[model samples]
Target: DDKDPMSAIKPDMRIKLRMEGNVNGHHFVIDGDGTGKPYEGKQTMDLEVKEGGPLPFAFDILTTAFNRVFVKYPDNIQDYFKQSFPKGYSWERSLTFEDGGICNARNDITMEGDTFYNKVRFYGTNFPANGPVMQKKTLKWEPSTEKMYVRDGVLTGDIEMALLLEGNAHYRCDFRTTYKAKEKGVKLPGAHFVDHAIEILSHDKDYNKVKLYEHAVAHS
Candidate 1:
């Protein structure tokens, strides 16, 4: 019998996870202990982003990738993953700015419940240069280059990922980094990162602290 990786999970088993490392030159620490309800349909969390953020960005993506690889059956399996199979696909992406200053910056954010902290850096060749010529990749991550290690009911390792967001061609944001995560018991491939929904409890103007539920992506 070829046992599935998720078969290791038990209904009553609770997992404690702590992910700490550097991402895009920013130090980050994410703690997911005491919230390991595998059968709750979704994992609830209150996140705190202290100095900066991005693992959520990476986690968000890897989960989707995991679904494509593990959960869903592909019709065109060959062409579907050919670009991402050994070497990741590469292409030039770009960004633009209409204002003539570093006014295009947003930072200092925190979420309550499950906590995540990290800082983000701007990408491009020219800084504070207006007129829409900024350039960079939209998204990039080498699946073949990233690695994760699990043993004895424990999971640990690092990941390399990137993302780019362009809003209306005026506002653009992106991040790229490699970070480590160490989790116990709740290691179901990327199941630990599969939350695609959330519910808000409360917040301030800056939205520094707010209670929320990190709804899990459906997996069985």
Candidate 2:
């Protein structure tokens, strides 16, 4: 049964996504990766111009608004991404890095069928030397998107940053998000996270990274 377990898995007509949003004063960048043939590639969107404002508050607002629109209407949102770009596209989380600071965060969303996944991780720059010190939060869909929207404010959390000069700083507010499909093959409709994972794991490997690749006939 395990051999054929995946056979019953129907083709997903939906899309996948990973988006990153960053705000420094009035400028922001929303980047994406789409899944097409071979592999997915990167796409850089147009710069977003907002009124000069506090960075932390701006970040919170935009992330909150993004959760509102897409989390409430995932189907509509997927349709929007699919139609907005001509090439095969997928979505992913957007990551932020302060030039000289140690505080950072990555906000991501994934859609599959009727399910939606969201995660926000705040990190301190000092941990692991190479990795982040993270705090993550995740949520699942309720009865329906409409009901979820009515309870939108139910999902909220806090992040405390202990800055050297600013001491402890807190930011609060909600803002909107805008995305564009810049590169091809990085984010594609119907693409799943596992597909991207496999690609990443297979890169630079000599064709044997995956078990299935072992059966290939080699000319060398």
Candidate 3:
């Protein structure tokens, strides 16, 4: 009624929160594409890029490709998810850039060693991330193949993964990388790469050490 409160909803839950607000003659344009029902208006965010400083935003999409899409499922459907079902879940998918320069690309997560060792082709690209592309830049791993192990939450062996730009290599971070902020990735899809709708909390690395890359898309 006052603000979009959907952020409190987690992945495994079957609830979505929405909001509407008017502050000094302003509303968040609160809206969503949920299949549950429809509102009379739109909730699309109003954002524009002008270059120079930081641009921050917050948006929602299927939490992940693993998201059972906003359709009708059975009761307790979210309970069926696990290492093999959610199959490909990512804990962190983000990239850092300043003046469009790419730096500090990461896609961190823990996976089932058994499944990872037995799977076929794998994908984990990036918006500016595509950290997988990092492997090709180096001979540290094998070709479109291989695995690195982890034990008890620790890197066990040499794991190999493919790295490539999420989309056009030009968008790959090559800008001035001296930015920092506190944020969360609202992973969304944009062309061939994962476009993050990051919600920035703070800026200026000198006093800004934490930053978020919102909507970080799952890469290939």
Candidate 4:
């Protein structure tokens, strides 16, 4: 039997999104039910844009920075992101660029007795040449009570500048989610959640910036 969609989700449910790579190594994770699913997972997707020779810092540093801050401070960043690129804004997994490029990525989600669908897209500014690129990843999730479904994966995207002889690399380190009972919040055997997020910072190369940003965004 299918459970009531609304009943399956709770007001306090949490969702997290993470990203890594590009200059300044960025990492972002958020907990909230704003996007319908108490927990959802999406696959990693890659896309590229070409222009001149080397890829611009905007595509690597700026984008990664934007994602890190946005997920941590969704309330403040969401509106800022939308306002920054109103027409090309992409809240979902789908990727779209201000330059009119689009990438359609799909989503995969699973719920208790019910299944959900998701999609994502990527847009690139410029790459090795003078072309913009985009890629999309979609996912479908199945519902369950015994165990929550989470997705973890990695992806790589890049841009090259011929004249400058430079290449910008974009790497998506981690992506995942957890679904739980509406009445019961995230299960914590002890203080795992606290350590989990902290551990990532301690070991990651971009720990300094990630920690600083996390403090500002999560607490703000």
Candidate 5:
């Protein structure tokens, strides 16, 4: 949660890491310095890991002289991930992003880098013409009917629907819901009770009651 979502794409970014452990043939770490600066005189972070090839560097500090999207929407991110390390969840098993030729995950990945560790991958969920572009299309709800029914001796109804998506599966739905008269208290005796009053419970001096009335959703 400490990682800034912006740091991944920021320019000349630098990362510092200190090793935490070596387990099951893979190294692990919980520490990193992403201050965007090169450490003076101090040796690298990842110090060593099996101790070889590229210093494991413990981290990748994008050069102090680094120069760095239609960014993809959520879920489409599943399409742009790299092989998982430590543990992995296959891409195909992921949920499909619901959009169109216009609003959707594209084949081209916009950015990528090496993490030397597992669990992180570059993403776009869209393609780069080298230039990326994406937009979301809101679902249009074209209502057919808003019918009513009686339940538990009270009134209720579902706004039957199929969500009108452009489709992998579009099906039936019933929005089970209930609502009652909105009301308020009154200083005068019984002035607050109108239309209907169902005794919810009884108290000696101040009795409790469910008052029903025709009311506005807002005040005048």
Candidate 6:
């Protein structure tokens, strides 16, 4: 064979994603970057939450990337999304964010030539503050780099594939004021507070893609 069969089957495969956000009195974050080889295609992720307020307004998010396969689907609605472009090899759906109150927003990425474009949109669905805020960022990916910490015929170093992705999203909410206002039967201010952290261990990895689904929903 002109091509080495072993080339396509590397011994170790690795990828990682880290995200964090703390606004208002609520906090949500995750660190799901790790390394593994082809085995039974198992995968898992976790999210931690810390809050300071009544109602403890919560934050939710979801992540999807190219080649990553998902094992579970939202109930009722039935549909699937496939990221594609000019002979697409890399794709990410959306950086979805949701709060305990009546607020949900998202950031979307689209491929253009060799760069990726994103639009971060946030809206205030809590009363007369229905206006929205948005920001945009277009970035070009850097060359992937990795290090091999090895010794005399032995290996001694952290092992992971080249870092491919790193992203962050931060926003504040009027949960505390909005939520308290409602409780007091007032209509002048807004208050809300909701925070949560639920991590479930799962054993189902296709290794082709990495999907992170947080407090949210699924649509057709």
TM-score of 2: 0.21
Off by over 4 Å in 2: 3-20, 29-33, 36-99, 114-220
Could you tell me every candidate's TM-score relative to the true structure?
0.29, 0.21, 0.20, 0.22, 0.20, 0.26
Task: Give residue 28's error in model 6 in angstroms.
Answer: 4.4
Tens digits of per-residue lDDT, candidate 6, 1-220, equal: 5965323223343434433433332443433543323222223343222222121222221222212112122333221111122221222121222323233333343334433233323332332222121111211122211121223422111111111121443332321110011122212211111111112233223211233322222222
Q: Write the per-residue lDDT of candidate 5 for residues 166-193, one digit (tens) a residue.
A: 3343423333333221121111111110
Alpha carbon lDDT at 4, candidate 3: 45
Q: Show where candidate 5 strays beyond 4 Å.
A: 1-138, 167-171, 183-220
User: Cα miss at 210, model 2 (Å)?
Assistant: 29
CA lDDT, every model vs. true structure: 0.28, 0.24, 0.22, 0.23, 0.22, 0.25
* After superposition, candidate 3 runs with Cα above 4 Å error: 1-106, 111-194, 204-208, 211-213, 216-220
Candidate 3 lDDT tens digits, 94-198: 233222322221212222322211111112223223322322221111122111122343221121222223343421222111111112222222212112232
Compared to the true structure, candidate 4 yields what TM-score? 0.22
Tens-digit lDDT track of model 2 for 1-220: 3564213121222223333433322233332222221111111111222322222221212321222211111332222233322222222222223223233444444444432233433332332222211111111111111111111322122222111112233222111122333343333233111100111212112211111010001010
Quote model 3's TM-score.
Answer: 0.20
Prediction 4 global C-alpha lDDT: 0.23
Task: Encode model 1's per-residue lDDT on 1-220: one tens digit a residue.
Answer: 5855334332333223333434223354444332333334333334443434433222222111110111121222221111121221221112222232121111121223222122222222233323232222122222222232333433322223223334423233232222212222121343123223333444343333333333333222
lDDT of 2 at 77: 23
Pick the lDDT winner.
1
- Number of the top-ranking candidate, with TM-score as the measure: 1
Backbone atom clashes (below 3 Å) for every candidate: 12, 31, 29, 44, 3, 24
Which stretches of model 1 miss by more than 4 angstroms? 1-15, 47-195, 198-212, 217-220
How many clashes in candidate 6?
Answer: 24
